[PDB]
Amino acid sequence: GYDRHITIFSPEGRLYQVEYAFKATNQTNINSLAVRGKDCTVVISQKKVPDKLLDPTTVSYIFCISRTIGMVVNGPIPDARNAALRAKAEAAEFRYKYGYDMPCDVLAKRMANLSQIYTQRAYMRPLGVILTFVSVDEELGPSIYKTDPAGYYVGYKATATGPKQQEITTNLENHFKKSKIDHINEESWEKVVEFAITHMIDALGTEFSKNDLEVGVATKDKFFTLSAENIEERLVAIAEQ
Amino acid sequence: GYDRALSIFSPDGHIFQVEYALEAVKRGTCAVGVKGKNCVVLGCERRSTLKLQDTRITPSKVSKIDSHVVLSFSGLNADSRILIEKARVEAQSHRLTLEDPVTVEYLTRYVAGVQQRYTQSGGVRPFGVSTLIAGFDPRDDEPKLYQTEPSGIYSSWSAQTIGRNSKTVREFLEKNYDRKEPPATVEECVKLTVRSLLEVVQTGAKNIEITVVKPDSDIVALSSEEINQYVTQIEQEKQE
Amino acid sequence: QFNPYGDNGGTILGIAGEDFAVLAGDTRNITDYSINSRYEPKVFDCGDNIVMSANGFAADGDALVKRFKNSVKWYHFDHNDKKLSINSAARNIQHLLYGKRFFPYYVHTII
Amino acid sequence: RLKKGEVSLGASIMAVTFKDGVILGADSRTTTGAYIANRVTDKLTRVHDKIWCCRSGSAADTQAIADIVQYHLELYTSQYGTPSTETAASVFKELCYENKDNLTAGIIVAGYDDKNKGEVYTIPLGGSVHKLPYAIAGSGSTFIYGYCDKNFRENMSKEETVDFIKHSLSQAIKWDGSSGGVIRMVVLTAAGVERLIFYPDEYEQL
Amino acid sequence: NNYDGDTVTFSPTGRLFQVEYALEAIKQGSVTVGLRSNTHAVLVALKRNADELSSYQKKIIKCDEHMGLSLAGLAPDARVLSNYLRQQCNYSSLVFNRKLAVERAGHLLCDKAQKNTQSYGGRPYGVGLLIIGYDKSGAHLLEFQPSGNVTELYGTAIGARSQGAKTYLERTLDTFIKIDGNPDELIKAGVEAISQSLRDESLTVDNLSIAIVGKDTPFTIYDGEAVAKYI
Amino acid sequence: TGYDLSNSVFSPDGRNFQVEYAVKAVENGTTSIGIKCNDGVVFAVEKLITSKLLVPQKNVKIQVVDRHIGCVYSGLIPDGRHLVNRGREEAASFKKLYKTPIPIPAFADRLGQYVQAHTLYNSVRPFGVSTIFGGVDKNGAHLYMLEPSGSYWGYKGAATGKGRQSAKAELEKLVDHHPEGLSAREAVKQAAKIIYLAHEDNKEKDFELEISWCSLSETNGLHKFVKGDLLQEAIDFAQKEIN
Amino acid sequence: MTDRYSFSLTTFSPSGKLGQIDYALTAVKQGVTSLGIKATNGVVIATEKKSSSPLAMSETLSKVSLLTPDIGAVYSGMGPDYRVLVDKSRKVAHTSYKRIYGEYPPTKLLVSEVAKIMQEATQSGGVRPFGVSLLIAGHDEFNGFSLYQVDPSGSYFPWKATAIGKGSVAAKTFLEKRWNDELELEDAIHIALLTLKESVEGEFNGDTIELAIIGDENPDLLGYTGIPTDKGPRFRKLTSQEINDRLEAL
Amino acid sequence: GSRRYDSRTTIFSPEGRLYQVEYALESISHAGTAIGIMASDGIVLAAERKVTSTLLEQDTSTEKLYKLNDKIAVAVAGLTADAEILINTARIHAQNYLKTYNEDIPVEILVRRLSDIKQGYTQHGGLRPFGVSFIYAGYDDRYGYQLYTSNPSGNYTGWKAISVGANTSAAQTLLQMDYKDDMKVDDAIELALKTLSKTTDSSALTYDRLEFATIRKGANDGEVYQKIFKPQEIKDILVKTGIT
Amino acid sequence: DRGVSTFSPEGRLFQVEYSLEAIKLGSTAIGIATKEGVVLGVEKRATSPLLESDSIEKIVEIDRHIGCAMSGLTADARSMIEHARTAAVTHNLYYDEDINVESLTQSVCDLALRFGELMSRPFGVALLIAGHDADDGYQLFHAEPSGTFYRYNAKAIGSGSEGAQAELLNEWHSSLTLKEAELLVLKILKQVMEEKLDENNAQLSCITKQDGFKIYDNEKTAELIKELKEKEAAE
Ligand SMILES: [Cl-]
Ligand SMILES: [Cl-]
Ligand SMILES: [Mg+2]
Ligand SMILES: [Mg+2]
Ligand SMILES: [Mg+2]
């Protein structure tokens, strides 16, 4: 059965290497979440530092692709960094060639097309990662677009990725049924981060310290990550209500 | 580029791809070459499971490489065209640089060298073809007949046959061909060639092709009626 | 426009006897009307009892001698330490020089 | 060294370090021969947040270079963080030096680090790099070598540096036909980035 | 078993079987010994023949006036690697007017052998080398293995039954290291060392091969009647 | 199955068995460590003395990259050398274009991307080394550890090889007992001790100690080897602790 | 390193089957149903928008794509494969035709170019076939309206009406009963919606259905005025509202 | 490395056969039958479409019969996509010859070159062969009317009448029975249809399941005309011979 | 399958070892070196009596001072000879001298291992290279597809090699004349050959300093065959 080793069709029309790349996604055992506000897009992810000898500041799965675009990865770090470096180069080249900042959805499509090539070309393996791109696009506003090893991509009102992704997904679904809208009706990004953390706590059923989380925020004309103290400040506000 | 080594040695010291190329030659229609005192004759079998053929336009079994040299073959027909084309090009190239047409030995050596190159080159299989190359050197009246094979070895023959049931016709030629006295005339040489094919062919109708080559670029192909006369003559002498 | 050649002056002289041979050359090196060095040797022992000088444009002269000295070294490696005969050296040098037929070494060589 | 009939950026450009950082300054004029193709050009251009450059020589060449440098420094930032002004000058040099025969670009690089404060690197036609306290360049700079050498002082204030640039470029404009229009300036400090403009009615009667 | 088809494949225990099979080719090769003092470095090599009618396979190759090696295993592979060393020694002379350090020589060989163990299609080198030389930091002896591993030593030996000579040198370490300014005695110690790897056969005039390099001695090889002194 | 026969093939788990097999080669190698300190880093390694015939001090395993980065590794030594050769090219092109010497995090990703690239195709073999490296740059001191998969993180202390667990345990104690920080000269002494303690897992052949360090104050931000009196002082400190 | 797969990954089996093409067609069978119907004055192409998640915005994912102003495309099978084919199809329409003749290619020739690309993925080294079947509707001056199907093998056939994917067998039967040569465009849209309701299981509205037409020229969608000969694109994607209007009188 | 997954498409069997060529021929034997018959005053090309659907657009369709130039046409049997690759190459080759010599390409030369391309895929490159067999029908001023066939092996032969694809064994026997040398085009048209009508796997032979073409000198004075039959024209010729 | 350049567990290259088996199937070739010259002889082995034996070219000239005999897949030797001839003439062009026999052999042997995944497989032919130069005098070399070459006083290759080599062991001494060597090649060839030895199915050649490399005529060899039979009957 060499049809399970490289990216060619099986008798039932399947690509097993692509399917197994999906299972590599959860190898890190980390859950991520993304939501949109009025003026912003917030992304959050679990941060697990098991070894005491590790420098915790260097342990990250969130990346600043361009000034406007941010990316969180679910999957092993080598493949994650591989994808990050390529996305950075693609976003830089786009700006040079076409005279304006690469939109979030366009970068997502580009990376998805690259992922598709690996599912069709034999010598290249798929990357075992799911890439979640976030920004505040100057045309489409707050944006969430997610890529997988199959080469599939789509926009999102909100989304979640990881081992306990389904619990987070339904938690968010039930909120948007209730609110009757496509986003978090909130002015400041600070409270949108508080929403994101609150609903992750409810879905996963765990409490979080400042070092157990990692947060990325996209606003108009800049994407940035939060420090431990920025998150701690945010955790205090949730507890006091 | 496709690099795979297809022709390789086996534990017992054999290159199976070259040997399997010989099996393709063994499948091919029989071809025979007989050289007389002042001529060479190339005989060729044509299988009769194909009726409704158009013999005007169907590729002939014997091919002119130059005006003084001819090449017949046994094995894969498509493969033979590639060797014939290369040989024809080399024939014109030799005239251009040496200001003299190729010798039969030189042309054979070139074709054999091409066949050999395909036995130790990556990404290619050997030619499923053995050839009989015959003719006369420039300003020379000594007849020349050479044989090549997929491995790339070549050699000169007083008379030789290749293809299916070639071991039967080789047996015939080995007792019927005298080294001390070869076929003195054209008629004698053609008759011996037709006789040898009649040991294998079936019917002497549109199954046998004969091509006669004489010195100073004198090559001609026999028609059906002309060949049929040899068939009619041999059978009447046989009933004895 | 950049001119890749120059004239370093100087002169050389070779004479052959019955059982010996001399190769002489002055030690002055110049450009235009200036003296660069009063002692800059341009006659070299290249091994195997072969002496060589390549006079004219010194950069080309040095490059050539350097390449021939290297040719002698590899001759030993490739042919079981065989002594390079003077006639063989001469033919080898021809190929060094003609190798740059279309961008020549501007030198007069004597061995 | 200019290609025939191509737009000429001949200029009056200068960058001056001072106590709080560095200030870039430039005129506004472009010529093809004696005709002023653009009278309101912006010759001060951003390659990074607080790393800018003054352009002179060929308009097309300097633009193409500046666009490439901006691309390199944006990619540098994504991997290694904020680049030094020296790093930016090095990228300019690499382009100017390696393509010295096909290019006519006299560029002044000026930036503000927090560690290194205000820095100025000038890059003439050859592609050489020269780190200086202040720098002048462009067709009109010849006329103000005397003036600028006599009047420049290290560790000046913002208002003094603005006056030094204004008076200098005013003279360069007055004597160089290839220079003119408005005087644009860009201030680089820890505070941020400030754009200044000065019109003929003001600076001519200095 | 299933993991020895090519060099690009690791075994479940983390082994490269093709590299190990290349190492095996060295063990089948004829014995050769290397040792040094502070002034000189010596190579001794037992040459092998096909039969009495044949010549004896040459084991020692000169790389420069100050450097050379002895081989054990596939001889053509030693020719490729020795040629590479000759070029690198030569590049150092022409470009930098500098004699190549014996340590750099080892580093260059290591990196050349390594590339052949990480790529598809190619194969590992099937030969072991003992490199001796005298450079600006005195005498040197190196041991090259086609896995890539290069090691600097006082003395060593590679090939069939090389353990006997390697044990002897391990005992004699304190004696032969101090043989300074005496070539013939350092060779004698090397000839006695290789003698501990002999079985049924003894050292004859066209069997033994010796090479030396040192302070005021260029790399030179001794064969034939020139080694009769040491029997 | 057969999923472990070819590199870059995902198993049904989502694993690359060939990379995991390369880790086994690393585990088989000698112990090497890295210790991050106040204003720099310290590297140490175990050199097994196979024979009396090995020249002491003359089989150097720790390698310098540029003038400010130190690299040490465990596993297939040649593979480590190949990685360092690449590192030196990466560092050279960075300094060529950007003038400044390559930052350590920058350098870490250059190796990471290169090693990761060797898990993408079946025509190449994964690296059979875990590499501990780091140095001093504009932002201060950094210590990293890189694995066959391409995975790397920053570290306070790092260890790999046959005695990694013993070394890790000893490293964890230093991090707990010194929250404010460890000095450069102290880290050299500690490095010696940890190698000697980690040698208990490889105690058939006796060994030779080798230490290097980068420090903003002690070495002026450059990579240097520890030799002579400072080396013997560190050895004596380690000898006293085992007894 | 380097792509060492210079050899075919699709080969003939003893029975004469090209396995990878067959398996690619199996992947198309699993795919969601899509269809195309040809009228006298237009063409309609339609498909279901299978949403991966309700949080996902199905508007961002477009199954029906514009290739030229007068040509559109829809698929069944693997979405990613389709997306890159659309990119290549749009480019080839320019490079191999418009940049030569100064006008857009007719439907049949653009289809031919797409087929060529899919055939090469069947024979070239180190690649698998595309796991999709396309339906391409289009108009051009000299051929009028036309509808084509393109399979993983690279084979293409012209259709009066057809369906591909999940429930194609039943859907083709339904179309045989309803199709005639006198159908107006509005009648063809009505039949398309009826045919698609049979295969769709969940919600059936303008937000879950994607439908586009090739019909009359649309000057309002051109974007400029002043050139009489330029009258606008014949390709138009029906809005969510426009679909729901026709679902009431169903 | 990649050696593991190589099918080795261009090798010999122990018996001296080319595996992939043999399997490509097996594929072609399931394709719709195509017949070529050469008369003294023209050539007929007839071909059966593969199981037609009633909703297939028949008039604006091309599956079997393709035009190479004004004087040469081909009938296809096998993978259509493969055939179109080869057809465009053949069309280009014909135009290269015309551009070079200012003369229409001789039929055999075009056939040889196309057959040489197929041969290449069996000897080198490591790719699968083209799963196609052609019947070439054409005219030139040297040999007049000519019929050839080529197959995945790259071997070509000339014919008076020939069939490719499905049921060639049965079809060739019927052609061999009723064919004669002094035959006219109109008679050859009737023979082509009668042969398909008996060898077909369908219930009855109809206009919608056929492609038909002639190459006559039926134009005005010493010039050749290619007629690709329309649906209604096939319907009429089918009634005229009394099949429907 | 498996790689072309793969090592066996014993430490040998599979393809090189398999090519050596092909050489054992080949026709016999013998070479003997003396102080008066070097003699080269081969078994022609015609597959059929109709084959004109004089066209069987298994002894070949490389230069005036270097000859060559072959055994195994003889078609593979053509490009080896072509290379040798070019190497020999090229060296004369660069250095105005004859090229050493050893250096020529080394040049040919460099081709041997230039195979893998360069050519697709090793050569399936062994060569006996005989010659003379001023430095090392008369020489005989055995060049294998392994890239290895040994110098020999005498050597036999091919199907009857092990039997012929044992015979050469006893018969060879350092004072052999050229005539004695000629007869010795014929004697040993007649012993190992299947068919009966005569002038048509066996060929002799030699290389001397004075006259260079010469292939003997069938008339000359026939007399040496007759001289050989008479001498064996004489005791
Ligand atoms: Cl793309
Ligand atoms: Cl401008
Ligand atoms: Mg980042
Ligand atoms: Mg793949
Ligand atoms: Mg002015």
Numbering used by the authors:
A (entry chain G): 2 to 242
B (entry chain C): 1 to 240
C (entry chain L): 1 to 111
D (entry chain N): -9 to 196
E (entry chain E): 3 to 233
F (entry chain F): 2 to 244
G (entry chain A): 1 to 250
H (entry chain B): 1 to 244
What does the paper say about this structure?
For subunit β1, this process was previously inferred to require that the propeptide residue at position (-2) of the subunit precursor occupies the S1 specificity pocket of the substrate-binding channel formed by amino acid 45. However, the γ-turn conformation and the associated hydrogen bond initially proposed is for geometric and chemical reasons inappropriate and would not perfectly position the carbonyl carbon atom of Gly(-1) for nucleophilic attack by Thr1.
The 20S proteasome core particle (CP) is the key non-lysosomal protease of eukaryotic cells. Its seven different α and seven different β subunits assemble into four heptameric rings that are stacked on each other to form a hollow cylinder. Only three out of the seven different β subunits, namely β1, β2 and β5, bear N-terminal proteolytic active centres, and before CP maturation these are protected by propeptides. In the last stage of CP biogenesis, the prosegments are autocatalytically removed through nucleophilic attack by the active site residue Thr1 on the preceding peptide bond involving Gly(-1)45.
